[PDB]
Structure formats: C-alpha cells, structure tokens
C-alpha cells in the first residue's frame, strides 16, 4: 500500500524540479503508469469514490507544477474514462478491469501518435520549399526527418535565446541531409519573407486553440499572421487542456534569471529586475492549421475535441 504513496511522492518531486521525462509523450506515459498503479492498488466501494480520490491526487499533481498540464489533462481524461465505464455499467462488479483495458487502449494509442503525425506529414510539404520551426519538440523532428526521406526541403530553425534548445534540433536534422539553417530568434522577421510555412510545437493547447508554446513564438505567430504564411501546429492530441487563456497569468514558466543575465555580471544586479519567461502565449486567430493523431483540423475544432474527451464538468480538476 505505501508503495503507492512513495511513487506518488517520487513523481511529485521529480515534477517540481526534475529535468526529464523529456518528450511530453514520456511525461504522460509515466503519468499513465502511476494512474494504473493508483487505480488498481487502492480501495473504493463505489466508482464515485475513485473519482474523488483520483481528483484529489490530480489536483495535487497539477497544483505542484501548474506550468505543465500534460499530467493534468491525463488525469482529466482518466476521470472521463471512469465516467464512461460507470455510465455503461449503470445504464460495479468488475469495472476495474474494464478501466484497465480502456487505459491500455489509450496507452497503445499514445505510443503511436508520433507515427500517426509522421504518416500525416508528407501531405503538407513538397520540394523546392523552405520551412521554419521554433524551439524543439520531438514531434516536429519526427515530422521533418520523416518527410525528409522522400524529398529534400530547406528547414530554417530559429534557436531560442533563453536556451539554445533549437540548436539541438538543427544538429539532429542535419543528420538526415535536410538543409538546416540556424538563425538567432531576433532575426525571425529578417527572414520571415522567405519561409513558406512554419511548424510550431507546444506544451498546451488551451480550450480555444490558443496554444502556449516555447518562448519566442508569439513573435513567430505574429510575423506569420503578417506575411500570411501558415502555422502548422504539430500538437499531438493529448496535449490539450480545458483551461482558457485569461487565467491569472501564472501561465508562463519563469525560469531562473541566470539564463539571460549571468550572476557573474556584477554590481548592476542591484536594481536590474531581470525577467525570463520560457512560455509565450499565442492567440487562436493566428493559428492556421492544427495537426493531430486524428488528422488535420481547424482552431475551431479544438472546442469540439475538448467537449469530446474531457467531460466538461471536471475542468476544475
């Protein structure tokens, strides 16, 4: 029994500080493992009692690091599934195993969302082209070195400044013969006139397509609203959340100011109130086309998907 609590605390701790799980796939995957553990190794007479319990644990897991909602939306989807099974068995005996098999279905789908996106890629790209991304998401690099083995475009990645994270992609993709050009984020607009389309990742897709991406992308969304080049948002379906943009703006992830202004700077750090957010909000209207493991979609379909998966009552989680 206590093994439950110890893996809970390990998860919460490695959530508060732990770098890695890297790909949000992996974060959701270990979240789902912990979910299975909780949902087999505890006591509950009615199913509503398990709803309440997992609601408690998800509330703690999200209010731990609210900057990351992959774990939160995983909890909400699991609560949807228990709602489903209770409805099916109400209109109690062994529904536990039904839960577990539905969760295994969810997990095997999760394990292949990346290849779904990969297979959906090549219907959007064609040669003699130039594409621009931002930051680094595993989904986008899968996308690109997937479309690379059929034809050779010219990717232009803009390294984020608070972390030269995009740098890594520009190395990785350089290992498929893909014509990667690394530009400094500031210079986005300086080449925005020769980027036929942009492919941006995320870490959330709020309830109206207003994604929240790595910093240095609201500028990208605006410079691509300007030139009317389109935003391919390569967001695997599990990254949503039923939360809406205007919420208390504890919304970015204010990382340590050592990234921008090193400590070895000197005295000037007396009153220089440095800042460093790593999440730029993006509004819906700039978002052209969502991709997902289902197919292609429009920023207006995201509300349909949110009413689809997460039962609209448990948004408060």
């Amino acid at each position: 029994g206590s093994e439950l609590s110890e893996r809970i605390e390990s998860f919460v701790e490695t959530l508060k500080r732990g770098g890695g799980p890297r790909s949000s796939e992996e974060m959701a995957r270990e979240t789902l493992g912990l979910l299975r553990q909780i949902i087999t190794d505890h006591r509950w007479s009615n199913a509503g009692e398990l709803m309440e319990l997992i609601r408690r644990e998800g509330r703690r897991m999200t209010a731990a690091q609210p900057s990351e909602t992959t774990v939160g939306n995983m909890v909400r989807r699991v609560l949807k599934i228990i709602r489903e099974e209770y409805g099916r068995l109400h209109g109690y005996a062994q529904l536990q195993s039904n839960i577990i098999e539905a969760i295994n279905e969810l997990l095997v789908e999760l394990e292949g969302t990346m290849e779904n996106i990969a297979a959906q890629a090549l219907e959007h790209i064609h040669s003699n082209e130039v594409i621009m991304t931002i930051g680094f998401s595993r989904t986008v690099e899968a996308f690109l070195k997937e479309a690379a083995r059929k034809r050779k475009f010219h990717v232009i990645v803009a390294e984020c400044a608070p972390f030269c994270q995009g740098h890594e992609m520009a190395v990785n993709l350089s290992k498929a013969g893909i014509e990667t050009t690394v530009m400094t984020d500031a210079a986005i607009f300086a080449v925005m006139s020769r980027v036929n389309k942009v492919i941006i990742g995320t870490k959330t897709i709020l309830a109206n397509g207003a994604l929240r991406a790595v910093t240095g992308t609201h500028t990208l969304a605006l410079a691509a609203k300007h030139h009317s080049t389109p935003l391919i948002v390569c967001a695997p379906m599990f990254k949503l959340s039923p939360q809406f943009p205007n919420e208390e703006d504890s919304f970015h992830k204010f990382v340590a100011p050592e990234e921008v202004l090193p400590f070895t700077e000197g005295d000037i750090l007396e009153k220089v109130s440095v800042h460093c957010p790593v999440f730029d909000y993006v509004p819906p209207e700039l978002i052209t086309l969502f991709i997902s493991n289902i197919g292609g979609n429009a920023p207006s379909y995201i509300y349909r998907l949110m009413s689809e998966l997460y039962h609209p009552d448990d948004h408060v989680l």
Binding site: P162, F189, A223, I268, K271, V272, D280
Partner: protein, 353 residues
Amino acid sequence: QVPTRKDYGSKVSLFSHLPQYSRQNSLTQFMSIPSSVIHPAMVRLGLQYSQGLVSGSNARCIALLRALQQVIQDYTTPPNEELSRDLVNKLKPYMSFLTQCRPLSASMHNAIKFLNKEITSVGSSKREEEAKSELRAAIDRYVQEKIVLAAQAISRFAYQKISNGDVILVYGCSSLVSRILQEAWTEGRRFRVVVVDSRPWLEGRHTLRSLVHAGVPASYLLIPAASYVLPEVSKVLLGAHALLANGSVMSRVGTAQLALVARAHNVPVLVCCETYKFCERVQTDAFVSNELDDPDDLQCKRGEHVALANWQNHASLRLLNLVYDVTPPELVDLVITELGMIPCSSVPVVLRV
C-alpha cells in the same frame, strides 16, 4: 597588394552573394608591419574594427574620422600633382582595405562621402599645408555638428515625448537612446526603462549598465520574450544604425521584429536618428544587403556542451546571423531627428531637401 579574408564554412541559400567573414584572420598577419603601403593609423583603425571593440554607428564613425584626421594632418604631398587628385588616388586602397577588414555601415559611408566632397573642395588655391589644416578643421567641425550637436538637439526634442509615470523600451548599444534617457532623467523626469537584447553579441548590457550607473530603474529580458512586456511598455524608443530612402529604418536585427510585435500590441514607436545616416539608397527587404559576421559565436554554453562544436564538419548545417534588418515605414511612428519630430513616411523628403 590588398589580400582578402576568405569565407567561413557555408553561407545560406539567399546569401551566397552577401559577405561572411572570420574574426581571426585579420589581414594584419600578412601585411609588412612597418606598413609603408597603408598608414599605420589606418591599419590600427581597421584592426580594432575587426575585433569588435568599437561597435556602434556613432562610435564607428568617430573612429573612422579620427583616423582620417590622424592620417590627413600627417599626409605628405607628391610634387607636380593636384591635391584633390593625388589624395583620393592615394586614399582609395585604404577604404578598400577597411571594407575588407569589416563592412562599412551607413554612417561611415556618409562620412567618407562628406570627406570626398570636402577634399574636392580644396585645391592648388592654397599650398599643401593650408588646405591640409583646413581639411582637418573641417572634419572636426563635422564631428561636432553632425553627431554631438545632433544628439543634443535630439535629446531636447524627445524630452517633450516622455511622460512622468510611463516606461520606455530600448534595444542594444544605441548611443543616442543612452544619451536621451540619461539627460531625460537629469531634468527630474521619471520613467522606468526595460531594455531588451539579442544573441550572439549580447549588447543590451551596454545600455543597461550605462543606465543604472546613472540611476535609471531599468529591467532586462531577452528579445524572444519581449512579447510579454508589451502589456505595459507605454512607448518604444529604438535606435537606427542607418536610414534609407523609403523610410525603411535599417537597424539591428531585433528592431523590426520588436516594432512589429509593438504595432500588434498597440504601443507607439519612436526611432531616433541624426541627419547623415540618411544614405541615398532604397531597400525593401532584409536580404539585398546585410553582413554575416564571424558566425561561430552563436554556440552557447548551455548546460554542459557547446551544441555545435563541430560547426563545419556537418555537410548541411549552415548558420546565419544577420547584423541589420530593415523595419518598414508602416510601423515607425516617429523619427526624432534634429530637423524635427518628423513621422517616418515623410522622411524621404525632409532629410533629402
């Protein structure tokens, strides 16, 4: 007799015609050190242009003109020759070498052009020494009136458009904005700057220092996060390391993007520029003329490893970092030059007539 600095790795698709130089093979290795070909003042100028010790537009122009003073007032005339012919002929290779060691910004180009006209002015009317000291006095009156008095009048102007209680925003080592913010703080006029900055040549530190060492309650944050501050940045006060015919303000790579996010965020813009950075040419895109520096400086000490240590051994990794972009005049809501607070669309006429 004037060698060249070879290219460095691989350029970008569009920039196979633009230059891309290296910060290591400064030509001062393969020029005879007692430079009886180039005046060692000119070589010292070129060299300390390469390493990037003197950076900004005003600063680079001051350096160029001080070197020109230092060489002219020690120039020696050959007999049976006209000054305004033998001088420019003995000079052209020096400008060629300067271009080689580092491209010429707009300010430096206009300074060279002014000096060419001034040299064409003098002639055999005076003997060598007279016209020489005259040229020197002329260059010095230029250095006074075109930049120093420029900054003065521009500060006096922009002191109108800074309200007690707002903030401002800057970008990098633009000398004029440093002077404006300082002098506007001395007159009892409170604000709160929020500098921004870009990589690699992280330079917003310059204005940040020069502000806090003068009591300006600043704040610092990299440019890709600038789109977070604009919910409060009640103005924007950019520099302009050049000006162009169509109101296309050519500046450092962040000004255009910043002005765009400012427009979309609904906050004013105010470039600041004196009145010789108006080069008499036009440019509508960020690609017909820019300068790719020594690119091997993008790599960051992020975490534990430089993410591109083997920058060139990859067959198809190509790094660009432009120095200037060209913000368009649909966004430049002012140009505070010493001739007035002229809005940017009406700049092709004021600074030209």
